[PDB]
Structures are given as structure tokens and as C-alpha cells.
Amino acid sequence: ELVKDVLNVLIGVVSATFSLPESISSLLSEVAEYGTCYTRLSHFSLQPKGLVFQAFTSGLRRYLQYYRACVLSTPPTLSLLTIGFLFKKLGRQLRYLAELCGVAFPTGVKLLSYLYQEALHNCSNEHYPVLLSLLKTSCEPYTRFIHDWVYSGVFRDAYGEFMIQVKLYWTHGYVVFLKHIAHDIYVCGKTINLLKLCVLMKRSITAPLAAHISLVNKAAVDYFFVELHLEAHYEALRHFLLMEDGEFAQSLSDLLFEKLPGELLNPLVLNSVLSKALQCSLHGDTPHASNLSLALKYLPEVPDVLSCLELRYKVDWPLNIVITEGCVSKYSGVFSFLLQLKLMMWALKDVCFHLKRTAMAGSVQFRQLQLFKHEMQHFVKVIQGYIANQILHVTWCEFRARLALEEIQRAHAEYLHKAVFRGLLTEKAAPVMNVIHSIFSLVLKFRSQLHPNFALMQQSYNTFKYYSHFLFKVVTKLVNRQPHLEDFLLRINFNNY
Amino acid sequence: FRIHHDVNELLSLLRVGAEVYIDLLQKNRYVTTTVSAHSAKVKIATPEDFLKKYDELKSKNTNLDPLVYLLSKLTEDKETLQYLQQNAKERAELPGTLPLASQESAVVEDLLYVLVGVDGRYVSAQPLSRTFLVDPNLDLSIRELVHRILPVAASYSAVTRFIEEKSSFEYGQVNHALAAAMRTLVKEHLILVSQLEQLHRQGLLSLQKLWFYIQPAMRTMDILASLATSVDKGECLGGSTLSLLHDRSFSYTGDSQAQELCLYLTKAASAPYFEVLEKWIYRGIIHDPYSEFMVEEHELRKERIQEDYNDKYWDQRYTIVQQQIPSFLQKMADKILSTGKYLNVVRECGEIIYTLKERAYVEQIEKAFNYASKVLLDFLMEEKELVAHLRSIKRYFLMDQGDFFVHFMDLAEEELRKPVEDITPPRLEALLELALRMSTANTDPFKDDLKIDLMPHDLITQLLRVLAISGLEAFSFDYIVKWPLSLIINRKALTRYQMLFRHMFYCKHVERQLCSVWISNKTFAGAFTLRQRMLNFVQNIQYYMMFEVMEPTWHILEKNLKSASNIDDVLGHHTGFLDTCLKDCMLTNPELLKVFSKLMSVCVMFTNCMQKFFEATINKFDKNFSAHLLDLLARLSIYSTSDCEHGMASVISRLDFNGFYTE
Amino acid sequence: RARNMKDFENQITELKKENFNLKLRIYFLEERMQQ
Amino acid sequence: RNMKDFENQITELKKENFNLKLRIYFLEERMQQEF
Amino acid sequence: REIITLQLGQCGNQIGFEFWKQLCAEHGISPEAIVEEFTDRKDVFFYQYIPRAVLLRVIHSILNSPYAKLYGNNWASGFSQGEKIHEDIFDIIDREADGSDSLEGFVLCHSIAGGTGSGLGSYLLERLNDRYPKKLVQTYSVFPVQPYNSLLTLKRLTQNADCLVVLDNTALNRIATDRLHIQSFSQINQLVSTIMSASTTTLRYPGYMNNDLIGLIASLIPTPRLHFLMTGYTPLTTVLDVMRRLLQPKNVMVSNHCYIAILNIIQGEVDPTQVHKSLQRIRERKLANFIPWGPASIQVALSRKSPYLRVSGLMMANHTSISSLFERTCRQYDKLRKREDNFDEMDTSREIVQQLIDEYHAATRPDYIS
Amino acid sequence: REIITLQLGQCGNQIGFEFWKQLCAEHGISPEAIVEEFTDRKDVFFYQYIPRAVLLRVIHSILNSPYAKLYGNNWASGFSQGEKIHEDIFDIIDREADGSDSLEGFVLCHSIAGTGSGLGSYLLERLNDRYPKKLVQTYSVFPVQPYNSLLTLKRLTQNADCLVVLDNTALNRIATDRLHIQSFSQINQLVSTIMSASTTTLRYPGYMNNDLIGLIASLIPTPRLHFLMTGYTPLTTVLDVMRRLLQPKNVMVSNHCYIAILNIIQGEVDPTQVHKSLQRIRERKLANFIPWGPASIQVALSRKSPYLRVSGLMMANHTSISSLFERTCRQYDKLRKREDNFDEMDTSREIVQQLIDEYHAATRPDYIS
Amino acid sequence: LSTEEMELYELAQAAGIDPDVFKILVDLLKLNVAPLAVFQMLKSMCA
Ligand SMILES: Nc1nc2c(ncn2[C@@H]2O[C@H](COP(=O)(O)OP(=O)(O)O)[C@@H](O)[C@H]2O)c(=O)[nH]1
């Protein structure tokens, strides 16, 4: 009857006619092509390299079993035309699945992306349920890995199929689904690992994911502020490195400058001046006050206004990540300039005391020189106030209300960058830094000449007045080309030109 | 200290400092790390030999994974291989007539008997890895499908041989529990075999039906067979077997079918190991029938520590054997040693369940460590107190009680200037007791632990030899303590107390004679100015030696012992106190001590000239002392500037207060 | 680039005090070899 | 002071530590072998 | 650096007692000189708690006060009294100085309203310069035979004291009558004690700028001859309100003319964001006149108020309008001269103050230099 | 080792007996020489407790006191009395020296102002010849009187190895400036505290200076310069104590430099700022010493009696003491010009002038030879 | 060389070294030293 012959080709078994009128041969040829793709798929997906590929193979085998179940179920024996028409709307779909597979082929995340693009390619057609079912059962290993960081956080890797693989402690490499979560997931795993050592709408995945990620991140931030006193370090850091604490700024500067070669650089003297200064600070003597070290980066051989000296804070493992090494380096840089500013106050106070002992001896020569000192003093004081206001008060107003894991890192870089920008240490304000250095040199020259050489003093003052006028001219021209610099001209110039 | 050997030996094997090369490893180091194998294997890949010979090593459970990663790194850098190759070369130089429809029942029914272990009519077992023969003439489809069902029979043969063999008494208790644990697993499989035997009589157990049915059993038999091969192919006992089971269980963490079976086997075979851990942690009793635990004991005589200096006892009584670590308690291995070690010393004077993903036992052992540490601390502080004994040893060895000593030299001055091996110990001991009774030392409950001893070497040369690598000076004190106290106060630390005393006694004695000279000439004129600078030096070094080194460090120790946590920190603090004290002394410096000892030799001989009662010798004495003192000041000034040490700065300020010796 | 210059004091004093402690061990054990 | 002598000084002290530690190792097995 | 205060006369003792009471209340210190359980540095004013106070009838009432545990009418007569007791008084001064680690200044609260404190103040300043040349001295003089004593002491003040803060009664009672409606001495001295505590706000509490007395005084004083100061305290609300309210004549305590230097202290927690905006508004509207010759600016500093005890504000300034008060004193001198052992030093005091009044009037001109 | 105290004159007996009450009160002993139960070395000043003192009309007042069971105006007249009681007094001295375990020093307290003046001068001459290897310590008290003082000073400056000056002019000064007494019953109260703390390190065991001998050779470099002053600040750290002792008014004295300064720190200060206190005083340059030979300043620590707050005592040996001797010299010249052989006073005049020359030249850079 | 040391040695030769050097390498790895540090040892030592 030939019904058993045609029905025993889609199963895979061979027949008398099927090895391995007259138009009926064409009809059998079409049915044979329907079975050869089934045989090719069975031969290709027999193995039970990648975990995602195994799940796809399991889904394909599950689908094939349904196809075998459907056949040899309804028709006991029907007409040859009837079986041809019945297996028409299904045979073409089988051929499409054969074209979808190899009968190279990607693996890992690439295969998941490739299948996803295939689903959108023919979403409207009847292949949507089949493609969706395969994609649902092919993402199972990936979902297990995603749930691993969410709950446990113990990284797992089978063959490196994923796009992600495995002091600074942040050397975990990272490099379709929405990109708003890929970076969030990657940083979420690191956060939970750190705490361990101390239509196509993807809604089912993000529904239980956003809530847990937010909970973990908030817990991590809360732990840093409460049980680690991170804010306490910042207020202590500002006290010491930025030299904001009184009776410690003056004490450290005074002791160092009292001496001035082979001295002042040995570890015996500089490691002890820090120890002595702490008691006079009266704001310290805590574990916070420890870890302060006077490091040196240059040894000069021998009027000058340069005295190189660093001051580096030290932190432990948990907070080494929050505070970067580069941030501490820039703290030393701004500290070195700010220490140089205090050099005037010690020297200017000394010459003020030096002139005090002269007093009987009252004439034009004495009073004329003292008016020069007052003019010298006012320029230093007025710019010192600008530095104090711009760096220690207005910038510190930000980052105090701003704070109330990666948020901490970005914010800290911005706070320091604004601090060094307002401090005129940026290369863009080099002419301002150059002209003040001339004033820096001129006043120390006035210090050197502690009335045998009054003409030299008068010449030095006149040079300063010209240089000060040049400073006002250059800053005024620079306004057209920095909102922070706008306040500087108001400080330097007030009821004058 | 084996790593320092490896770097030097490697430095001799190949041709090229070693100081930095070991610092890269000291900061990096019982923990074992793991790396990916597939990436390394493909990186290496005639590579074909590597791919087949590798599988043998992991079968033996051999410290394997880290080395494989190292080969991949060496392959990346070709120059390393070339140099290694160059270095290697340098060193070297009747179913046939039976219907096909009815043969299926016969085939499937005979396949039901081989599962039990009995040979079948057609499917038999070839005598010895087990192999089977089915039929010399059968249908191709039937043979191929039976061959699919064949391996379950071989797995059953392996496991039933494993349990029968591993029942011996010479393999440890952990092997017995492991063998007994799986006995229920094979029993359940036999019940399923019998259940399928009763189902087959109805004819509803086909060849295809059996193949689907054995699928849960196929994985169960496969995992049991793999465990049997792993244990058999490599000698595993004690913690080694537990580590293998734990590693296997963690490997199948993404299956959810082979993880529960491994978890149950591990938690059932860990009872012998966990049961003996309970008595080792809560008590100091170790049964140890076979060498399977991670702690072993070596028999050492207790009096060894008091007798000599070299033999270690604290680090030798109990040591870790690394092969037997269960691989999941390595992070707390050192604490476990402390628990038993602390309890063992105090016992002679007067529940844990295996869990997965849970650290309940980790917290359990920590508070057990806390209680064991706490009970030991109060044991030695409340009774046989430590602080009083240290105050007592400070009284005599460190000359705290000056009334005792000022009478001692004034009583034994004539019997200590005689040459060595000419004074008998009993006469010194009798004078010691008489002086102690007369002085205010009678208020000492532990006054009966001071014994006179005489050393064979002088202090200066002994210190010179140990850094470059008789008469009165031979005098030395000694102390005796009981065993529970002697653990921290031993010869390893006591010899520093007496070494410090020798310089202390010499400086005190020379000052006493020097002071006595002042009254001998107290009523030709240049000796007064020499004496003034002479006495002001010995007192100044004495004051610095005593009121800025002895007390400030001791007061730190007194505050430090009030917050102790375990005896390990107590001994570390005590050896820290002694070591920093010697550093703050004038010792531990070859150049400094040699000129100091030369000056002290000048000190003693000058006083001998005064009682001889010449003008040409006082100027020589002045010129010798001034040159020595100026050389002395130069060295400490250099040593206090290039190197940071507040003590040397203090003595320079203390010795000169008027700016004199400005050169 | 530049040393802390404070841990340098702590680092130098730890090694020197350790070296003397290690030196004192070799001599008391070498004399045992002679004895 | 040369800012380079510090590196040389540290290496010299570390040399006194490593070399002396090595001699300890050699002499330990001598005690084990002698007995 | 320890700072020691001195009180002279009944007026100085009264303001000094009120100054100590307010300062003690500012910190967590009980009236019985015992710290209570309840950052700030009390070591500068207090020594281990006893205050470094020296007091020279009224004393008996002071001892009767609960704070007991916190311790003629002619110029010539006052001079004679100091001479007879100079050694006794300087004995306690020297021992206090030796007990102090390093003295910085010498705060004095003396009155020149015809009392003996003016005579004692003249002697003490003379000897302090003689014996302590490196030690700064500052006195908070107050202004009312009265015309005589009010100007003889000016001879010594202009050549001995490095700094001087004037608090006349002409403007003090005006504020008391207006904003308090008093129509006593304690009612008018309480405001003065409030200025005294707020004057050294940057001294009690550590800060980056102006950590010591010489730091503040040097900026305001261009020449030792010009060593006069005036104070205001508008608390009686942003930075603009404080800055604007500190310039009206109703707030300045003084009976062309321009300023030389302005230092203002803000004791509140106001946001530093708007400090420069207030500075621009002051310059744009031009509420103040400065010197034309040299570049003169305005400076402001911030400090934290005591949490134990609202935005405060104090101003310190030197104005050439202070010359008006001196001309009034000199005019009373000339009128009283003709109305009634050699009267020689009495003349040179007039010459010296007339030299000072010339210098003030010569600093307004654009050619003051050279 | 043992010390026997000797008291001479009305002033000497009063100071010694007053010192004995203070020592008895500080120690745990009853006035009747019986230990009270209610650690410290007591063999120095007590015998198993009968004090080792040789009492010599003050004695009549003493015997009425509850401590009873515990035990003329010319220098020439005093010398004659000593010569005539030669056998009487030395009999008690000899019977005590043999009974002691080992004699090490003598304590002499007296005033150079009648009978004690002559007796004290004669006693030191005989003790040197009889006992040339025994230390003598004289706690002299300073107030006809010109000649008596110089005659006593002639013996003290060469026959007594040590001497401490205590003049009534300085005693009344502190008694008025810090005590407001306006009597002899109150000025000696400070003397008792100085005397009690004078040998506090001898009585209390300590790290150093547990023997009397070591407390002199540190301070006195040569037998000629053998004068030690006293100081007492408490009438707060060691630095405050150090600064206050050096203050000129504090010292018991009515260019110039020190020789050797000994400080006793009675307080319970932790022994960590004992060094930096010396460091800070060096930087500030609070005082100066001899420029020729090296000179050092030393400090010692002790503890209070728990049966009984920071104290301090200073031993000062400065060349400034020449002013007091020059004051005695100037009044001697005035008395001489205004009025057997009368040659002893001439010898006394020359020898003290040599001491003045030695004291004044001690500050020169070339004092040697 | 021990049997295990030779057992690991044969794979090293199979993958493509001095036997005494290899024994030291095995000893270092046995003492828990990380393999990455060992290569950085060799790289700075074989240069
Ligand atoms: N400072 C002080 N001096 C005293 C005391 N008692 C007596 N003196 C001095 O002793 C002197 C009297 O000596 P005096 O007894 O007459 O000598 P004597 O007759 O030889 O015994 C007086 O000048 C007083 O200065 C006292 O309690 N304190």
C-alpha cells in the first residue's frame, strides 16, 4: 500500500525503496528530503564545546521527540495525497530548522546573541513559539550564572564561554541584552565579592534583579560610612594634609624654618619634628593622627623660595580602593605650594620682630621702610585669604552635601580636581603662577636684606610694584578667555587700578 | 627556611640579587590555589603526547594544577625556553535459528541477571576494567543497544569489589565510613533490580523501556565507579579522601543531580574525622589509631628547655602534616593547634556536623579557641602569677634593689679579685645568703631561686664574635622556674637577661671603685680635673642606661601584658622587650663596642695607680681618655644621623651639656 | 618614587634587631657543634 | 647623603639577613645528619 | 602661647569680671571652676581650671560673688601709688610669666575716666616696655579734672602699647538708651563683655588664618604710630545682612576720612558660597571709602560658634575719623589751661599728641608716602 | 652600712630632733620606738627602734616630750670646753663606732652663730686625725659673730668634706613672702622638710645612689669646692619643677655658673618625660656651668611613703656662694679696724681669701693649674 | 629524583628543562608558592 514505506522515512529507519504512473517518484523525493534533514539533525545533536550549547542540544532533542510523537499517531493508513498534504505545513518548518543549524557555529554569549537576532528576524511568522522555546531553554546556564552573583557571589567558570573572566584588586576583565544592566551586573559582583573578604521585553530578568542590586549597593555604602568612619578620614585628611588645623600649621612651619645641607634631612630630625608638633596641635593624638609621614623626594645641595618636602597619608586595605594613589599625590602637590605660602608669614613676622627691636631712632628713613613692609604684607595676606576661601571653604561645601560604591570614586576625583583648579596649580594658569613666583623671589630678597643699603631696598620695592601692576594686567586680560578667576581680581583690586 | 635554599641552589644550577627575588614570594604565600585547565591545555597544543599522558595524573590525584599553568607561561616566552634548553644542554654536557520477535524477551531477561552480579546464559563476564560478551551471532541493532546498557554492569562490578576490599582495618576509619556509606546505595539499586524483576513477568519491560529506566541509575553507577577508580588509583586516607570528595562535590555545582549524592557521601564519611576533632579541640586527648589526622606528636623531654638554649619545644611538640589537611579547614589550621597546645599544658596541672555553604563549624572552633585562650591566660595570672615573677627577676638581674647590691660588693670585694678556678662556689653562696638576710630583700617570697654561676668566656669577646660572624667578670646570675612558668621564661630568653647583667655589673663595679678613690686622696694637682670628667662619664652613661632605657621600656611591657589575648602574643612581646633593650644599649654595634671596651679598659687601670702611693703618666692618661672619648663621640654622632636612633642622640646630649668637646 | 622616610626608621630597626637575634642563634649552636 | 646610598644601605642590611639565614639552613641538616 | 590679662580700677575690674563670666559660660566650665560633663582650646586663656587674671573695695564684692573660686583722683597720685607697690605687683607678674611656657601678649582692661587705673596703667605700660621688649602688649581702653587725666595717659599709650581698642561712652549709652531703654553700669558693660569674647573668636578656636594675636594686629596697623582700632557688633539673615549692617554710624562706637584695612569675623554656620557675592555688592554700591595711595582691600574670616551657648558678626577697623575725638580733648585742654613742680612733661604730652593728630590728617592726602 | 647622727648646740639639737619627728611620722613607727602595723630600707637611720643620735638646756625641754622613750658665747670658750670634755664626749663616740656594722658617714647639725660653734670646730679637727677614712657631713646653720663665723668657717672649709648653708636671712624671706609669719618655731619647719628630703634616696631603695658616698663625688669635684645649696618648689610636670628650682628667688641664697646639680623628683611621674625635660631646658638655656671642664646635670626619681602631689629638691654647688663669704670678709675687716697671740684669725683670713680666689677663678677658661 | 618528581618530569618533556632545576620548581610549588610569582622569579632571573 506504500503507506508504511512513506511513514517509515521520517522516523529514520531505511526501507526497501529508501536506501542510504511515473510522477510518483517526484512525490517520494519531496518526502525523502523531509526526512534527510531530520536524520542530519539527529546525527548533529546526538551528544548530550560549551554549557550553552549543551542546553540548546537538549532543547533540540526535546523538540525532536515531540515531532516523533506527532508522527505515527494519527494516521493508521491514508491516501498518498493525504499524507503529502498533511506533512506540508510542517516539513518546511523542519527544513528551516536544518538551515538554522549547520546541517561554523558560535558558542557562549555569541550564540545567545545570534539566536536573539534570529527571533526578531521572523517574529511575526509561525516560528516564534519554536524559537522562543529554544531560547528559553538555551539561556538556562546563563540565568544560573546571573543568579550566582546576586545571591552567593562565588564566581563560576566552565570553559570561559562568557564574555567575562578572572592593592588595586580590580583586575577582573569585562569585555543583545539591554546595556543598562550589563555594567551594573559587572560592578555588582565586585561589590559583593569585596564585602565577602571584610514584542521582546526582558522584564522577567530585571524584575527580581533591580531590587536586590539596589539593596546590596545601599548596604555597601552604609557600611563604609557607619562602621568604617570614612567621613572621619576626610575631615581628618583636610585637617592635616590641607594644613587647615591651627596650632599645627604654625608649629610645623615654625620648627622647620627655625634652622635655616647635611642637617634637616636625616631621619632623626624630620621624623621627630612631626612627633613634637602633634602635641602642640591639640587636635589629634588619635589613631587618625597616626600614619602621617614626612617623605622626601629630592635632596638639594644648598634667597631661594623652594624647599621640597612631601606629606603622604597612609590607609589600610578596606579603604585603599576608595582613596586612589594619584589623589594622595596631588594632596602633596597642593600641600607643597601651601607650605610655601606659609613661608612668608614666618619670614614676614620675623622681620616685623626684627624691626621692633630697633626702637629715639625715629626719622624719615625708618618710617619709609616700614610702610614698604605693610605694602609687602597686604599683598601676601590678600591672596592667602583667596586661597583659603577657594580651597578650604567653598570647595568643601561641595562633597559634604554631595555625598548625602562608584559614586564615591567619581565624586572624590571631582572634589580634588576642583580644589586644584581653584588653587591656580593648573597648567592653564601658568602665567599667573610665573608672575607670582617673581613676587615670591622679590619678597625673599627683601628678607635677605635684614641704613647701609636703603637704595637696594627702594629698588626692590619699585620692582615689586611694577610686577604687581603686571599681575593685575595679565589677570584682567585672562577674564575674556574661568569663573573661579573672576573672584581673584576683586580680591587683588579694590578702590584702585 | 627552605625557600632561601631553593633560590641559592637555582642560582648555582643556572648562570647569572637573590634578596629581591625571594621578596616576590614571601609576600605571596597551607592554602592551595587553582586555575583554569582548558585554556592552558589548548595553549600548549608533538603536542599530542601531552594530551593523552595528562589524564593519568589527575586520575592519581596528584600540586598538579599550578605547575600546568606555569608551563603555559613558559611556552609564551620563547626566550625562557631557549635559555632553559641552553642551561639543560650545558649541564648534560541459538538466536540465529530463533524468531527475532521472541528473542527480545530472552535478551532483556538475561540482561536482568548480570546487574545482580551473576553470569548470564548469553551475557557473561570475561575474567580479568571489566568487559562482557553478549552473543557470537545476534542482530546488529540488538547487540548495539545492549552494549549501550552494558557499562552499568561493569560499574556494579567495580563498586562491589571496592566495598569488599576497603573493609580492612589497615586503611583508617574514614575509609570504613566511606565504604559503609555506599552500602545502602547498592542495596537500593538491587531493590530496583528486584522490582524490575517482578515487573518483567508482565512483559511490560522492553529493551527500550529498560534503557530509559536505567538512565537515573546510569549516572548513579557512573559517579560511584569514578569515585571508586579515583580512590583506588591513588592511595587516599585520612583527610586526603575527604579532600577528594569535597573537590568532586564542588566540581558538580552546576548539575543539581550529582551534587546531592556527593554531599551525602561526604557528610556520612566525615563522622570519623569530625568525631576525633571534637576531643582534640575541647580536650587535649588524641586517640590517633592510624596516621590520618593533621596533628602529630613528637616525644621530647620537658626539662630540655631549662637545660639548654637550642632545642625548640613550643614549635616541636605538635606540628601539621600537610598531606592530611581536609582542604576545607586550612584557614583555621593554626588556631586548632593553639587550642590543643593551650589545653594540653593546663590539663596536666589542674558537636560538629558537616555542612555545605555554611561556616557553622568555623564559628564554633573560633569561640572554642577564645575560651581555651582565655582559660590559659587567667590560669597563669591568678595563680602562679606572671607579673610578680617578672618584678622579681627585675629586682636582681636588673639591679632594681640597690640596697641588696651595695652590701654585696662591699662584702665580697676581696674574694672576687682572685683569679678564676680559685674560688669555690659554696663560699660565694654563703655570702649571698648572709647579704640577702641582712639587706631589705627578706620581703621576697621567691628569694630562693638565685644561684651563682661562672661563665667560661668574657662578655666583650663573646659579643665581638657573635657580631663579627678571667677574674671578677666571670661572675653571673641564674634563675630557676617551674614548668608551667618556664614555657615563656626559658633559656632562649633568659640568656639575654644575664648578658645584660654582665655589662650592668661591670659598669656598676668600676664606678664603685672609682668613687672610692675620691675618698682615698681626700685630704698631685692635675688628677682632680681628670677625675671630674672621668666620673661624669660613667654616671652619665649609667643614668642613660637606667632611667631612659630600663624604665620606659618596662612600663610599656607592664601596660602591654594587661591586654593579652593568647600566650603566643605574650612570648612575642617578651622577646620584643628584651631585643629592643639590647638595641638601646651600647651593645649590638661592633665599631661602637670596641672603642667603648677600650675606653673601659682605660677606666679600670687608671684607678689602680692611685693606691700605689708619676707626673709623666697623668698627662698620658689624660691624652688617652680625651682621644678615646672624642672618637667615641664621633661614632655615635655619625650613627645617630645616618641611622635613626633616639638613644644615641640622648647620650650625646647627656654626656656634654656645656658645648665642650666641640671638635 | 620616593620612600615614606618614616617606615624607613621602623623598617631599618626591625631588620637590625632581627639580625642580632639571628646572629645570637648561630653562635650558641656552633659552639654545640664544637662541644 | 646621595638619595642612592639609601638603596645601597638597605640592600646591604638585607644581604646580612639573607646570607646569614642561608648558613642556618645548611647547618641545621648537619645536626640532623650528625645524629 | 599663653595670654595673660590685667584689670585696673573699678571700671576695669567690673568689665573684667563680666568678661570672665561670659567666657567661662561660653565653655563647659561651671562657676566653681569645675568642668562639667555637658575641639575648643581653653589652654590659651586657662591654666591647669584657673584664669590667668590679675586684679588691682570692689574686690571684696567680687569675692562675695559666686565666681570666687575662679581666681586718690589725680594722675600724680596714681603714679605715686604704683611706685610704692611696683615691686609687690611685679612679683606676681614675673612668677606668672615664668609659670607660663611662652607668653605672647598682655591684655589690659583699664579706664582713663579720671580714675587711678589711668595712673597705674601709665606706669605698668612704662615698665612692661622696659622689662619685656619682645612681649606684645594690648589694652582695651575706655573713654568718658576729667580732661586732664584723659590726655596725660595718651602720652604713654602712643609710645608703649602696640595696639589700642577704644570704647567711648558717648556711643555705648546711645545704643543702650535706644535698643535697651535703660532710662546702669552692669547694663552697659554686658554689651562690652560680649564684644570682648567675640573679639578673640579666631584665637580660642583653631583656624587656618590668624592663629595668634600678632597675626591679626599686624594687618590693621600700617605704622606703629597709627595703632588705633574700633569695634562693632551688629547682633543686638545672610552674609549680606551682616556686612551691610556693620557700616552705619549707628553701630560704630566712635563719637576727608577713609578706612585703611577691614577684618571682619563671622561666627555663624552661614554658607561660604555667598561670601564673594556680598563682597561684590559692597564694592558696586560703594558703602565704604578706602585709601587712594596704596591698594587696600577687605578681609573676612569664618569660625565656629560654641555649641554650648543665629549668625554673629564683629568688625575691627581703623578710621581717620578717630581724629575728631582727639581734637575735642585738645580743645578742652586749651580751654582748661587758662582757667586753672615745673610742668614740663605735661607740655610734651600736648606736643606728642599734636604730632599724632598731624599724622592722622596727613594720611588722607594722596601723597602720604615720602 | 650605718650612719650615726650628731647634734650640737641649741639650734643643732632642735633641727635634729625636729627632723626625727618628721622621719618617725613618715615611717610606720610609733613615737615610743615601737613598730606600728597600720618595703622601705630602714637600717640606715634605725637600729633594731633606737635612733643613732648622740644628744649633747634644750635637752631638758626634749625629755618631757612624748618622744622621750625614743632615745659660752665665745669661740675660744667653746674650744676650751671641747678640749676639757675631750674624754667625756669621745667615750660615747668610740662605744658606738665599734657596735656599727660598717661606718660610712657622720651627720653634724649645728649653728655657727656659741657653745656649738666652738664644739663643732674642735670636733672636726679630732675626727679627721682619729678617723681619716670616714666621711663627715655638716649641716651648718648661718645667722662677736664675725670672728666666730670665720673661725668656724676655717675648720669647716678644710676639715668637713661637705657643708650645706642655711641662713636665717633667706629663711625669713620665704617665711614672709610665701607664709606671712609677721618665729623660730616656723622657719625650722621648712628646714625639716629639706632635711627629710635631703637623704630620701638613701632611706628609700632606688636604682642609683643607694649609698651616701656616691652622692658627694658626683657633686663635689675637689675638696676645696664642697658647698651644696638647697631648693624646694612646692610651698604640674617635671618641666615646671625644673624651671622653678632654677628661679633665683627659690634658692636658699641671700661671671657665675654651676658645677654639678642634683635633682630629686619625688613625684610619681612616668619615666618618659624625664629625658625631654632635660632636652627642653638645654634648648632654652636656663642656666650655665663651668666652661673649663665638662659639667653635667642629673635627676633622680623616688616614691612617697604610702602611710603619709609632686615635690622636688635641688643640690646646687655654684661659685655665687663667694658673695656670702665676701660679706663675712667685709664685716671682719670693719670689725678689725674698729676693734694669746691673736694670729689664728690672721690664718683664717688668708685661707678664706684663697677660697674666694679659688671660687672666683673657677669660672675662668683656664682654671686648671 | 623521586618517582612523583620524575612522574611530573615526563609530562614537562612531553609538552616541550633541567631535572635538578625541575625538582626545585616542584619543591617551591609544594610549599604553597603561587605559580605566577615563580614565573616572575624566572623572568627576572633568566633575562
Ligand atoms: N634658723 C634657726 N636658727 C636658730 C634656731 N634656734 C637657734 N638658732 C640660731 O642659734 C643661735 C643661738 O646659738 P646658741 O644656742 O646661743 O649657741 P651656744 O650658746 O654655743 O649653744 C641664734 O643666733 C640663732 O640664729 C631655729 O629654730 N631656727
Author numbering:
A (entry chain L): 351 to 370, 390 to 417, 425 to 479, 494 to 556, 566 to 574, 586 to 608, 1474 to 1535, 1541 to 1582, ...
B (entry chain M): 4 to 19, 24 to 36, 39 to 54, 59 to 75, 77 to 107, 232 to 266, 271 to 492, 502 to 620, ...
C (entry chain G): 56 to 90
D (entry chain A): 58 to 92
E (entry chain l): 3 to 40, 45 to 54, 60 to 67, 72 to 86, 101 to 173, 183 to 221, 224 to 276, 288 to 306, ...
F (entry chain m): 3 to 40, 45 to 54, 60 to 67, 72 to 86, 101 to 142, 144 to 173, 183 to 221, 224 to 276, ...
G (entry chain C): 33 to 48, 51 to 81
Excerpt from the paper describing this PDB structure:
The exposed γ-tubulin molecules recruit α/β-tubulin heterodimers by interacting with the α-tubulin subunits, thereby realising the function of γ-TuCs as structural templates for MT nucleation. For ascomycete yeasts, MT nucleation occurs mainly from oligomers of the compositionally much simpler γ-tubulin small complex (γ-TuSC). Whereas the CM1 motif of CDK5RAP2 binds to pre-assembled γ-TuRCs in vertebrates, the CM1-containing receptor proteins Spc110 and Spc72 promote oligomerisation of yeast γ-TuSC on the nuclear and cytoplasmic side of the SPB, respectively.
In vertebrates, MTs are nucleated by the γ-tubulin ring complex (γ-TuRC), comprising γ-tubulin, five different paralogous γ-tubulin complex proteins (GCP2-6), actin and the small mitotic spindle organizing proteins Mzt1 and Mzt2. The interaction between CM1 motifs and γ-TuCs has been structurally resolved in both vertebrates (CDK5RAP221–23) and budding yeast (Spc11010,15), revealing a surprising heterogeneity in terms of CM1 motif oligomeric state and binding mode. However, in contrast to the general conservation of structural elements involved in dimeric CM1 motif binding, the interactions are divergent at the residue level and the CM1 motif-containing α-helices are shifted by 8-14 Å (inner and outer helix, respectively) between the two systems to accommodate structural differences in the relative positioning of CM1-interacting spokes in C. albicans and the human γ-TuRC. Cumulatively, while dimerisation of CM1 motifs and general structural elements in CM1 motif binding are conserved, interactions are divergent on the residue level to adapt to variations of γ-tubulin complex architecture. Additionally, CM1 motif dimerisation may impact the mechanical properties of the inner CM1 helix (CM1in), e.g., by increasing its rigidity and stiffness, which may be relevant for induction of conformational changes in the γ-TuSC.
